[PDB]
């Protein structure tokens, strides 16, 4: 197997060249090709020349697009994670530099560093805290009395939980993201570390603001303008300078910069629309060095030779951060745009940083002096990733055989940047948008002027399938230009589309509320299905007696009168499959906050959920169907599985279990003869009953009140400025296309031909407007209950792949005292 690299250099090729030498992977060939520039590797790996780089951040977004259709594949984490166990990386890298005396961080079994750290070959020692930061003031010479060094093994909200306000934490001691202050109605934000972000104060009896979930990192990397002190020009005088940029695509040498000076109006630009954002700069800027650039003006002063004058390539010598530094040091510009990496103390003689403030400090304030954060690269293939198992093999053994991936005495920054620690894969989930996250992924879109200008007037609703995306097409078609109708493969497809700003509605079931709620999304209506009132249908607004939502209940079956909820321990169970919310999430949510967390085995007998361990005590009732007894069939996710569903957790209970964990209805619709079917043709809802949380027992009629929980309703989600015309609209269309429409004989919006249950359940009623009440969102849309049983009442419940891309990454202040 091969994995070819490309290199955009000479010295990029001499780096490549030596690791196929000295970097044995067996089974696993590296082999480089040598392109031009940066854009032309990724065109190279288009085309199937090349198989794996590595881009800037600034370049992700544009590099998911034509002419290229790369995807990130392996990068370093860029979040909390990335220090996890990071004392003992930093050790074997210390340990890898193979120099004598030099200081080897210190590390305990578990991974987690030494509160005290000691440089052997000098008898010096400093405390660190649990991110390997040096505490302030604590390094002692040999022979005096050491500083005393502490654990700290508490979180800072669970710290300041020692501390008798009160800060609610989730379970891993961590900030939430709302903060409600209970003696008085106010609540706010916080930013990860307990801060209050401006603009999230809200008071008693006003709709609070839906907060975004944080993380903090620790190691950051900053875009900075470096200048010399010899000058004297501030950065509101930018205009008419000349400048040495890293590259006319990296973050670190252009978007940032870009982004300031349009938020100070210091650049004239109308906008990606009129005018691209190059030409704009190239009338700002006078001569400059900006690699890749396609001004004229804009290569004037870089220093490479013919062929390689101005290239997104080492071969142009002031290319990249260190490039730019020697063009601002050799006075071919007056200010230098790069990445803080190229700061050192030697340099703080001669060199300052050049703030948005318009004043000047020195090189240490790189933190209070910069243009933005600079996330980490990543290393790309093409999308359709034929080679990422090879890509990945390769450069994990690589990293296990200690490979030098990430140093080289040709340079800096070669192949990868040298600060990276470990890279590690990525999952195939993730593309442009849950690499950069939301809001980044959002900004390079505006800044390429692929930004869509959003319509009032129009719905753009998401599909999951074909089915769905044809019975949208002939809502579109009778919609007036009112409905638009976008694809998507599964409802979190559409739940991205809508993040991405690619779609404006989707219906989603409770499953996929919390992820769609996390990110900043709204319901803007829900799915009525009392199919007993039509009233609040026929008159939007009028009271409700009963949404029609489904009730989760453990049926018994009244003659086994020893069964009560304090019992069940050790009890036979049915459940309708596993993932289901009245079979499954529930009740194993009610069984987990009771008593420890063991569902498999330690609680059940020999139980039937489908979907479960084929060899556990969950499957042990379960049979197959004798049509193909040959087959097991037993826990299957499907039809197959008897004892799957409604009716086959009702036959479960029927045949073999005590408890069944179901909806209300199922009891109703297979007991009083309305079940045609061998078993229960003679059974009777009054032969069953229901088990309540204070362990008494009631009729199967008594589900509103003696129930294990409510569910709440399917919910049609948008982003929040398209709340309003969204409920417009889909009211307008509700008058037209509803179960009393005015044409309902040319659409119906709950009912097709080409299937069943397609964009929303048939069995809807109707939609209703979710009315905003000033609560949680979280506890406003599940209820209270439903949000404390399965989340416990935490935005920190859950993680995936979304979440983490909704979730924002900041770094912290200056000092690390502590
Ligand atoms: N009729 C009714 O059942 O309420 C409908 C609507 N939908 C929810 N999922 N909710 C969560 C709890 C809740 O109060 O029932 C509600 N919260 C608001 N703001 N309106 C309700
Ligand atoms: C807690 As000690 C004496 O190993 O620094
Ligand atoms: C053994 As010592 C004085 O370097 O902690
Ligand atoms: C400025 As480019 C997208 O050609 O690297």
């Known amino acids: 197997k091969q994995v070819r690299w490309c290199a955009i250099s000479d010295l990029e090729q001499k780096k490549c060249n030596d690791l196929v030498g000295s970097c044995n992977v067996p089974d696993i060939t590296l082999v480089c090709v040598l392109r031009s520039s940066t854009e032309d590797c990724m065109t190279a790996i288009k085309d199937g020349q090349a198989d794996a780089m590595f881009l800037d951040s600034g370049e992700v977004y544009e590099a998911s697009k ?57 008898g010096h020692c400093w405390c660190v805290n649990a991110m390997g930061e040096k505490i302030s003031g604590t390094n002692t010479p040999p022979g005096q009395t050491r500083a005393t ?36 109605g106010y609540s706010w934000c916080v930013n990860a570390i307990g801060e209050e972000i401006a603009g999230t104060k809200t008071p008693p009896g006003k709709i609070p603001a839906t907060c975004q979930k944080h993380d903090l990192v620790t190691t950051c990397h900053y875009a900075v303008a470096m200048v010399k002190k010899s000058s004297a020009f501030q950065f509101n005088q930018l205009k008419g300078k000349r400048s040495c940029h890293s590259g006319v695509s990296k973050t670190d040498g252009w978007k940032a910069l870009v982004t300031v000076l349009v938020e100070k109006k210091l650049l004239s630009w109308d906008g990606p629309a009129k005018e691209s954002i190059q030409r704009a700069m190239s009338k700002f800027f006078s001569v400059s060095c900006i690699p890749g650039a396609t001004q004229t003006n804009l290569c004037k002063q870089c220093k490479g030779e013919e062929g390689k004058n101005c290239k997104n390539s080492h071969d142009e010598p002031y290319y990249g951060n260190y490039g730019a530094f020697r063009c601002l040091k050799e006075d071919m510009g007056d200010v230098a745009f790069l990445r803080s990496t190229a700061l050192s103390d030697e340099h703080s003689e001669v060199y300052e940083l050049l703030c948005p403030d318009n004043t000047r400090k020195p090189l240490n304030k790189y933190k209070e002096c910069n243009l933005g954060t600079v996330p980490a690269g990543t290393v790309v293939t093409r999308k359709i990733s034929d080679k990422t198992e090879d890509i990945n093999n390769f450069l994990m053994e690589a990293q296990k055989r200690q490979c030098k991936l990430f140093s080289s005495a040709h340079g800096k920054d070669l192949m990868f940047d040298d600060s990276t620690l470990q890279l ?52 579109s078609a009778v919609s007036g230009g009112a409905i638009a109708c976008t694809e998507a493969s599964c409802p979190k497809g559409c739940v991205k589309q809508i993040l991405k700003g690619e779609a404006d509605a989707v219906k989603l079931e409770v499953q996929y509320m919390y992820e769609a709620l996390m990110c900043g999304l709204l319901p803007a209506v829900e799915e009525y299905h009392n199919k007993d009132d039509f009233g609040p249908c026929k008159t939007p607004g009028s009271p409700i007696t009963d949404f029609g939502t489904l009730r989760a209940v453990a049926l018994v079956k009244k003659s086994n009168k020893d069964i009560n909820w304090n019992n069940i321990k050790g009890k036979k169970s049915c459940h309708t499959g596993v993932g289901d919310i009245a079979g499954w999430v529930i009740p194993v949510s009610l069984i987990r906050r009771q008593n ?74 297979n007991t009083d003869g309305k079940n045609p079917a061998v078993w229960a043709k003679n059974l009777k809802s009054e032969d069953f009953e229901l088990l309540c949380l204070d362990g008494s027992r009631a009729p199967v009629s008594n589900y509103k009140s003696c129930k294990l929980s409510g569910i709440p309703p399917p919910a049609i989600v948008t982003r929040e400025e398209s709340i309003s015309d969204v409920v417009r609209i889909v009211a307008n269309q509700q008058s037209l296309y509803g179960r009393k429409g005015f044409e309902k004989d040319m659409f119906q919006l709950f009912s097709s031909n080409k299937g069943n249950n397609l964009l929303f359940n048939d069995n809807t009623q109707c939609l209703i407007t979710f009315d905003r009440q000033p609560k949680d969102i979280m506890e406003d849309y599940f209820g209270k209950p439903y949000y404390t049983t399965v989340y416990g009442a935490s935005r920190s419940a859950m993680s995936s792949e979304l979440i983490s891309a909704c979730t924002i990454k900041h770094c912290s202040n200056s000092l690390e005292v502590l």
């Open 424 to 475: 590690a894969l990525l999952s195939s989930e993730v593309d442009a948008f849950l690499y950069l996250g939301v809001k980044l992924f959002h900004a390079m879109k505006a800044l390429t002027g692929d930004a869509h200008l959003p319509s009032k007037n129009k719905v753009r609703w998401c599909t999951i399938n074909k089915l769905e995306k044809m019975k949208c097409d002939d809502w």
């Open 66 to 122: 034509d002419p290229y259709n790369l995807k990130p594949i392996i990068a370093e984490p860029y979040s909390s994670n990335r220090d996890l166990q990071k004392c003992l990386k930093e050790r074997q890298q210390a340990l890898a530099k193979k120099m004598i005396g030099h200081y080897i961080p210190q590390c305990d079994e578990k991974g987690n560093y030494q509160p005290q750290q000691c440089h052997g070959s000098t």
């Open 149 to 184: 060094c502490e654990r700290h093994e508490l979180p800072k909200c669970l710290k300041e939980r020692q501390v008798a306000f009160v800060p609610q934490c989730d379970e891993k001691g961590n900030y939430e993201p709302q903060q409600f202050h209970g003696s008085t």
């Open 596 to 669: 420890d967390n063991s569902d498999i085995d330690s609680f059940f007998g020999e139980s039937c959920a489908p979907g479960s361990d084929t060899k556990s005590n969950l499957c042990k009732l379960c049979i197959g169907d004798p049509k193909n007894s040959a087959a097991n069939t037993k826990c299957s996710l499907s039809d197959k599985e008897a004892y799957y569903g409604n009716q086959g957790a009702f036959r479960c209970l029927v045949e073999k279990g005590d408890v069944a964990f179901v909806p209300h209805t199922v009891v109703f619709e």
